[PDB]
């Protein structure tokens, strides 16, 4: 309603390889999905722990 | 994390009742860009509000027609009055009212003051009167929506209803109307140079700056919740 | 024309500018408004005004 937002239910992900893979989500809000993806990239890339 | 230094709300300055420049705590590197962008996007995205949704006025039957004693057109009435915005209580789908005569300019103040709404400014326009004998009579129905709801988007709601005399118009239903990010880096000496992001928010004044920010944050968190799974 | 009465009824309409319709400019340029971007898309100025 006023504050309810659509949550993605279809989370089927296909793994191309042990490292290569593509996931997909169910309907995100128009423009909100794009913002979510961009922020996911920015965070998951700008900071990612690991020994190197 | 390794001392991720999560930011928090602080130093919120209200430039005006509907103009504000707020701050937050400093955050670690890489979040400030993401924080500011996602903040502007989410805040502009869904800011629920109350607005005028359907109009039933005694005088006119067809708004594309004129009205003696009144200056502006009925469509002009719909346009200027569409500038009506008011804080609404938990109650929704209310009917405010406004009826008066005279020869002075007509202001928004001449509206029936109910217990669940508050008119932000007495300065809006209600089609200032022209003749002494004329008397405008109207009752404006207000609904609570999240965004622009098209005029024919509400068409299917009425099958046997909506008589000639009760009509619908369009709206925005989002008191946000401004959300912008500006990331700087200051107040960081004890630890590494962190970044604090200032948010310029100019709402309709219907939603409070911190309250709206909190609502948007809750929405974003709810969204990200499934993302873990 | 042998009609006992001819009655005319004139109705009104408003139309909404939607994707694909025709516009141009006084500097001589034809074009169509063709992309409906959600308001979170159109770029915003440094002062934020898109």
Swiss-Prot record, chain B:
EC number(s) in its UniProt entry?
2.7.7.6
What GO biological process terms are annotated to this protein in UniProt? bacterial-type flagellum assembly; bacterial-type flagellum-dependent cell motility; cell motility; cellular response to cell envelope stress; DNA-templated transcription initiation; intracellular iron ion homeostasis; nitrate assimilation; regulation of DNA-templated transcription elongation
Top-level taxonomic group: Bacteria
Post-translational modification comment from the UniProt entry:
(Microbial infection) ADP-ribosylated on both alpha subunits by the phage T4 protein ModA. ADP-ribosylated on only one of the alpha subunits by the phage T4 protein Alt.
Reaction catalysed by this chain? RNA(n) + a ribonucleoside 5'-triphosphate = RNA(n+1) + diphosphate
Molecular function via GO:
DNA binding; DNA-directed RNA polymerase activity; protein dimerization activity
The segment annotated Required for interaction with Crp at class II promoters runs over: 158-161
Q: GO terms for CC?
A: cytoplasm; cytosol; cytosolic DNA-directed RNA polymerase complex; membrane; transcription elongation factor complex
Q: What keywords would UniProt list here?
A: Acetylation, ADP-ribosylation, DNA-directed RNA polymerase, Nucleotidyltransferase, Transcription, Transferase
Q: Which stretches of sequence are listed as region Alpha N-terminal domain (alpha-NTD)?
A: 1-229
- Entry keyword Secreted: no
Q: Its family? A: Belongs to the RNA polymerase alpha chain family.
Q: What does this protein do?
A: DNA-dependent RNA polymerase (RNAP) catalyzes the transcription of DNA into RNA using the four ribonucleoside triphosphates as substrates. This subunit plays an important role in subunit assembly since its dimerization is the first step in the sequential assembly of subunits to form the holoenzyme. Part of the processive rRNA transcription and antitermination complex (rrnTAC). The complex forms an RNA-chaperone ring around the RNA exit tunnel of RNAP. It supports rapid transcription and antitermination of rRNA operons, cotranscriptional rRNA folding, and annealing of distal rRNA regions to allow correct ribosome biogenesis.
Show the domain comment: The N-terminal domain is essential for RNAP assembly and basal transcription, whereas the C-terminal domain is involved in interaction with transcriptional regulators (such as CRP) and with upstream promoter elements.
- How the protein assembles, per its UniProt entry? Homodimer. The RNAP catalytic core consists of 2 alpha, 1 beta, 1 beta' and 1 omega subunit. When a sigma factor is associated with the core the holoenzyme is formed, which can initiate transcription. Both the N- and C-terminus interact with different regions of transcriptional regulator CRP. The rRNA transcription and antitermination complex (rrnTAC) consists of RNAP, NusA, NusB, NusE (rpsJ), NusG, SubB, ribosomal protein S4, DNA and precursor rRNA; S4 is more flexible than other subunits.
- Name of the protein in its database record: DNA-directed RNA polymerase subunit alpha
Full-protein positions shown: 5 to 233 of 329
Swiss-Prot record, chain C:
Q: Which gene encodes it?
A: rpoB
Question: Post-translation: what modifications?
Answer: Acetylated on several lysine residues in the presence of glucose.
Coiled-coil intervals: none
Q: What is this protein called?
A: DNA-directed RNA polymerase subunit beta
- Subunit text: The RNAP catalytic core consists of 2 alpha, 1 beta, 1 beta' and 1 omega subunit. When a sigma factor is associated with the core the holoenzyme is formed, which can initiate transcription. The rRNA transcription and antitermination complex (rrnTAC) consists of RNAP, NusA, NusB, NusE (rpsJ), NusG, SubB, ribosomal protein S4, DNA and precursor rRNA; S4 is more flexible than other subunits. In pull-down experiments interacts with CedA.
Species of origin reads Escherichia coli (strain K12)
Industrial or biotech use: Co-administration of salinamide and rifampicin or salinamide and myxopyronin suppresses the emergence of resistance to both antibiotics.
Q: What is the stated purpose of this protein? A: DNA-dependent RNA polymerase (RNAP) catalyzes the transcription of DNA into RNA using the four ribonucleoside triphosphates as substrates. Resistance to the antibiotics salinamide A, salinamide B, rifampicin, streptolydigin, CBR703, myxopyronin, and lipiarmycin can result from mutations in this protein.
What family is reported?
A: Belongs to the RNA polymerase beta chain family.
């Amino acid at each position: 309603s006023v504050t309810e937002f659509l949550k993605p239910r279809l989370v089927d992900i296909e793994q191309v390889s042990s490292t290569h893979a593509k996931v997909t989500l169910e309907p995100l809000e128009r423009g909100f999905g794009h913002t979510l993806g961009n922020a996911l990239r920015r965070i998951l890339l700008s900071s990612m722990p690991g020994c190197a | 994390v390794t001392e991720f230094l999560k930011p928090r709300l602080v130093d919120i300055e209200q430039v005006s009742s509907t103009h504000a420049k707020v701050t937050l705590e400093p955050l670690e590197r890489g979040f400030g860009h993401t924080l500011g962008n996602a903040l502007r996007r989410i805040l502009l995205s869904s800011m629920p509000g109350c607005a005028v949704t359907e109009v039933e006025i005694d005088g006119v039957l067809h708004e594309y027609s004129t009205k003696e004693g009144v200056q502006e057109d009925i469509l002009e009435i719909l346009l200027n009055l569409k500038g009506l915005a008011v804080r609404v209580q938990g109650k929704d789908e209310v009917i405010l009212t406004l009826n008066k005569s005279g020869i002075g300019p007509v202001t928004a103040a001449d509206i029936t003051h109910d217990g669940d709404v508050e008119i932000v400014k007495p300065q809006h326009v209600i089609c200032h009167l022209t003749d002494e004998n004329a008397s405008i009579s109207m009752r404006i129905k207000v609904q609570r929506g999240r965004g622009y709801v098209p005029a024919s988007t509400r068409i299917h709601s009425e099958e046997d209803e909506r008589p000639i005399g009760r009509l619908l118009v369009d709206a925005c239903y989002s008191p946000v109307e401004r959300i912008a990010y500006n990331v700087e880096a200051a107040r960081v000496e004890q630890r590494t140079d962190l970044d604090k992001l200032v948010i310029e928010m100019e709402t309709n004044g219907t939603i409070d700056p911190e309250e709206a920010i909190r609502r948007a944050a809750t929405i974003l968190a709810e969204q990200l919740e499934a993302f873990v799974d | 024309p042998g009609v006992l009465k001819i009655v005319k009824v004139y109705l009104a309409v408003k139309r909404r500018i939607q994707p694909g319709d025709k516009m141009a400019g006084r500097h001589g340029n034809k074009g169509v408004i063709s992309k409906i971007n959600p308001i979170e898309d159109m770029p915003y100025d440094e002062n934020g005004t898109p």
